[PDB]
Amino acid sequence: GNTTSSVILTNYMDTQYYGEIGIGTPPQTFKVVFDTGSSNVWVPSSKCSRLYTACVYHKLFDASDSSSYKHNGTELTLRYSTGTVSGFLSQDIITVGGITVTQMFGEVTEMPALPFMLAEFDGVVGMGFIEQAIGRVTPIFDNIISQGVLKEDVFSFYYNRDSENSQSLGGQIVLGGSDPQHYEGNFHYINLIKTGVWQIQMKGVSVGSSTLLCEDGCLALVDTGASYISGSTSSIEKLMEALGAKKRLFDYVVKCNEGPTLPDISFHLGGKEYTLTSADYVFQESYSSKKLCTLAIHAMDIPPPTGPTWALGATFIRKFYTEFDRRNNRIGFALAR
Ligand SMILES: O=C(c1c(Cc2ccccc2)n(-c2ccccc2)c2ccccc12)N1CCNCC1
Ligand SMILES: *[C@@H]1O[C@H](CO)[C@@H](O)[C@H](O)[C@H]1NC(C)=O
């Protein structure tokens, strides 16, 4: 068609980027992450037991208040690297950036405190392919494309560096195109290894001058739902050894004074080198030799068939404006602004 639709995103602490969607008639509004690492839409349900503290602290969908709701009831379990949710399938009208679509989604009735008591968002909108959809439910972007309204069969992500500042724009998703106000130079495209997953070949990971990791190639999942850049436990422990970082419970840390002294990290993608300086990957909350500063990179062991794989999350997207091209099964990067 002839239209472009944008979704304004809120940036919470450079870790969570989410926007609003409306579900039902009248619309029930939810804060959702737009996740290229998954293919299902879900929100917490009014049928969720209140013994789940996450269901007490999040917005719940009430099918009994929606006149456009259509029952299904098929049970589903959605397993992620950080945790699992369980519930059942429902159908209703979903509003995303002015676009209205009839969508099958999950009503979550089992929502663990860890990690969901840490989510500022309520649910998730899966931006991945039908191949990875649980219960083979048609993903939302596929349903939007069927309407024949969007200018291009593409969607783009802008994640802002600034979270603290008001009047800044936390981020932005453009359905059906890109926003040239948020990137500079030209897009550099990398073809997907295969359709069904937003995953590309990575030809090397350099720490400083030498290529210390991913010699002989490896995989890179471009994941909008991930806060950090992640690699396997084996890759990260080698990376962190090179940086001189100390392993804590879930993350890696450096003495704050040493943060600025850290080397550049380069990701070799489609013949181009994508470089992050220490300012890009260190949470520089102070300069004290008496304080510990977290790194926006951690270990995450993603199981087969998708993994073992690196994941390029918000840490990477903040520097590089990303276009997800469904028409040509490729990913484009440009310097964000
Ligand atoms: O499990 C996670 C991730 C989730 C929770 C989630 C689940 C589904 C969609 C979006 C966010 N979060 C997460 C973010 C904030 C609070 C609690 C969890 C991560 C933070 C860093 C790395 C990974 C994940 N992912 C796997 C699936 N793709 C996105 C990343
Ligand atoms: C739920 O919807 C799916 C469509 O994917 C269909 O296969 C199934 O029969 C539906 N179940 C009910 C109980 O309506």
Curated annotation (Swiss-Prot):
Residue ranges of every copy of the Peptidase A1 domain listed in the record: 17-334
Residues glycosylated per entry: 2, 72
EC number: 3.4.23.15
Active site (catalytic residues): 35, 223
UniProt key word Hydrolase: yes
Domain of life: Eukaryota
Its job: Renin is a highly specific endopeptidase, whose only known function is to generate angiotensin I from angiotensinogen in the plasma, initiating a cascade of reactions that produce an elevation of blood pressure and increased sodium retention by the kidney.
Protein name: Renin
Organism of derivation: Homo sapiens (Human)
